[PDB]
Each structure stands twice: as structure tokens, then as C-alpha cells.
Amino acid sequence: MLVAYDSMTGNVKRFIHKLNMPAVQIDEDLVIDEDFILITYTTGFGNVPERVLDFLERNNEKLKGVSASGNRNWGDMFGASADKISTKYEVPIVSKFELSGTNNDVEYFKERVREIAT
């Protein structure tokens, strides 16, 4: 299954390279026409990056789940971009992880997506 993602300072990009899954970085024009999982980072005060928001306006019909990278220093705003996308589009939160993720984060993600894809 396809993974769509966005990264500003490289942490999500590094997480992606641990997954060994088909993955593509989003831009403003990109159109995905098959089921995908979104991985976004968290910016602002628990907010979704604007480029991810714009991308989802065109592509939310094929969105099946969301993970978020963040930092537990943000308290209840940890990975809260996932919560906002999950409630907005009624898709599950796949997982939340810190920065580039641990090896347990990787395996938890792959187990969660195999669970979802049925």
C-alpha cells in the first residue's frame, strides 16, 4: 500500500526510508488515485502543515489512515496533527512517533497497516 508523506526538517523522510514501502512526498499538484496512508509531521500548536491540508482537500477519498511524527515535549499536543486529520476525515490514527521513530515505531506501524488493509 502507498504511503504519502511530508517532511520539513527530514525526520519523517528518515522514518520513510526505514519502512521499505512504496512512498511519495506530497506537493501541491499531486493526485493519488489509490488507497494510501498519510504520514505528516506536527507544526505550530498541534497543527497540520498547510501543504498537507491542501493535499487532503483533493485526495481525502483515498485516505485510509494517518500517522504523525512529533515530540513528546509538546504534552497533549504530541502528534496532534493525527487527531485533527482522524476526526476531520473519519480515518484511524495508525500511530504516533517521535522525530525519526524507533525500531519499535517502525514495526508497530507495519503491523497497524496490515491490520487496517483488511
Binding site: 526538517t9 500548536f45 513528546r72 515535549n73 504534552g75 497533549d76 499536543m77 517521535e98 522525530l99 519499535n104
Partner: protein, 298 residues
């Protein structure tokens, strides 16, 4: 001579971090800490000494970052928008340092506070820890610095922002996660919110300079970065031994130190060097506070 022009962006990051700085603006008058004394009198003597000692140590580190770290790095930057962000971050280091005095005023008498600051000034371990960091800053006190000297000063600064504070942050978070000294914990959380974005920003700047170094200089700073990390780690272990042995928390703090060392490395774009363990669940509870979502712009 160049004036700063914010209508033409010098990089892809400075404007967003400028705005975030200001949205996170806060001052100690916003948090009253007097209600903390109800739980402060419930702590044992050994617990109170540990708490006053870690705050003194944090005050020292913020003093050096606001008065040496940010000003000497920013004066040598050519990017005028990034320079602006660092000047504001340096001002917030002084707000942090002052906020620890606001906590002390409530918890201790005038004479207790002087004793703690005497202890900080003369403690050989704090002197060595602070001296290692600021020796990278003092190299920059000359008209021309090399990119290698500026890179190593940014590494030193990230290691302070993202790593060296946390042997001290541990204990206020540990208590607040148990419902003790929660007003003071709110201030510590506002501080941590600032340091989290400080470390990211200086890490970005360091990575831009790294790409401008020659192949040989990249190899040199990579080795020196690893030696500095481990040198500071040896010092942190001696420090946590001195502070936390009496209250039985040495192993817990050391785990938390390695956990944040890995974050500091990732801020520089480097791979973690310590084994991955999950955060102490009580510390994690202490990081949940309603005050952290306050936006100045609202």
C-alpha cells in the same frame, strides 16, 4: 552594508520560526506559584535540596546561553533573518533564567537562595560542564571565524538546548507528574516548549553550514562532535550521581539523559547513539499541562 529585508526570504525557515517565537512569548508574571508551598512542605529535606540544586544548575545554563551562546553565534551569521530569530531566542533565555528566581522566591528564604547560588558558583562539576560548552562560544570572540568554528559552536548550543538541560528538567517534571509543585511545573513546561524549538532551529543552521565544509572538515567535525557528546555524557553521569543518589533516582535520570541526547543528535541530522528506551511514564505525565497551548496571537 546590508539591511534586513523581510520581503525577500533568505532561507525557507526563518520566518516560520520568527512567528513561532512570538506566538510562544510569555513572562513569569503570568504564572503564580504561591499555591505550590502546600505540596512543598510535604517533601522530605533530601527532596527539597535536590530540587533547589537542579534549579540553580538550570539557572546557570540559561545565563550562559542568553549572555554568551546566542549573542556570539548570531554576531557571525551572514543570514540576517536567521540572525533576527537568534536575537529573540537569546532574549527568551533571559526570561527563562529570571523565571527560576520567581520559583525560588516562593520556596525559599533570602538566605536559602544566596546559599544555593553560592553553591552553583563554586561547584567544580558545574564549572567544568559550563566551561566545556562556553569554550566553543569564546572561540568566536574575534573578528573572523571559520565555518568549522561556527559549526562546532552550533553543535555545542544544540547539545545544551536539547540534551544538557534535561538532567535538571527531569525532577520538576517527575514531581509535577505526581501532582507536586505543579505551578512551578507549568513554568518548566513553558521553558521546555521554547527550548524544543530553539534546538530544532540551531540544528537546521548547523546542517546548512555542514554542507559548506570540505570533505576533510566534515570528517573532522564529525569526530569532534562524537567526542564532545561522550565527554558531556561522562560529566552528566557524575552530576546525576551527586544530585539524585540521596533520593534513589539515578538510573531513572540517566535513562532520561540518553533519551534526550538522541533527540539532540537528531536535531543535527545525525543518527542516535544510545539504545532506544521509552520515556519515564511519570515524567510524561508532568509534560501534560493546559498552559502549553497558550498562543500570544490569540
Amino acid at each position: 552594508m546590508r539591511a534586513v529585508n523581510w520581503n525577500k526570504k533568505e532561507d525557507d525557515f526563518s520566518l516560520m520560526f520568527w512567528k513561532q517565537n512570538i506566538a510562544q512569548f510569555w513572562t513569569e508574571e503570568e504564572i503564580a506559584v504561591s499555591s505550590d508551598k502546600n505540596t512543598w512542605v510535604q517533601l522530605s529535606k533530601e527532596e527539597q535540596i535536590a530540587y533547589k540544586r537542579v534549579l540553580g544548575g538550570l539557572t546557570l545554563l540559561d545565563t550562559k546561553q542568553g549572555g554568551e551562546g546566542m549573542p556570539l553565534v548570531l554576531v557571525h551569521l551572514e543570514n540576517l533573518q536567521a540572525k533576527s530569530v537568534l536575537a529573540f531566542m537569546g532574549a527568551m533565555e533571559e526570561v527563562h533564567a529570571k523565571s527560576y528566581s520567581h520559583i525560588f522566591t516562593t520556596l525559599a528564604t533570602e538566605e536559602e537562595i544566596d546559599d544555593i547560588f553560592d553553591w552553583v558558583d563554586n561547584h567544580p562539576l558545574l564549572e567544568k560542564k559550563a566551561g566545556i560548552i562556553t569554550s566553543y562560544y569564546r572561540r568566536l570572540l574575534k573578528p573572523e571565524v571559520t565555518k568549522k568554528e561556527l559549526y562546532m559552536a552550533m553543535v555545542a548550543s544544540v547539545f545544551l538546548e536539547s540534551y544538557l538541560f534535561y538532567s535538571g528538567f527531569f525532577y520538576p517534571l517527575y514531581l509535577a507528574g505526581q501532582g507536586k509543585l505543579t505551578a512551578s511545573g507549568e513554568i518548566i513546561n513553558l521553558i521546555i516548549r521554547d527550548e524544543s524549538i530553539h534546538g530544532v532551529f540551531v540544528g537546521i543552521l548547523a546542517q546548512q553550514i555542514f554542507a559548506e565544509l570540505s570533505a576533510e572538515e566534515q570528517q573532522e567535525v564529525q569526530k569532534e562532535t562524537q567526542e564532545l557528546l561522550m565527554e558531556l555524557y561522562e560529566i552528566e553521569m557524575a552530576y546525576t550521581e551527586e544530585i539524585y543518589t540521596s533520593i534513589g533516582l539515578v538510573e531513572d535520570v540517566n535513562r532520561f539523559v540518553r533519551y534526550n541526547a538522541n533527540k539532540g543528535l537528531m536535531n543535527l541530522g545525525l543518527e542516535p547513539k544510545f539504545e532506544e528506551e521509552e520515556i519515564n511514564p511519570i515524567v510524561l505525565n508532568g509534560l501534560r499541562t493546559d498552559t502549553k497551548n497558550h498562543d500570544f496571537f490569540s
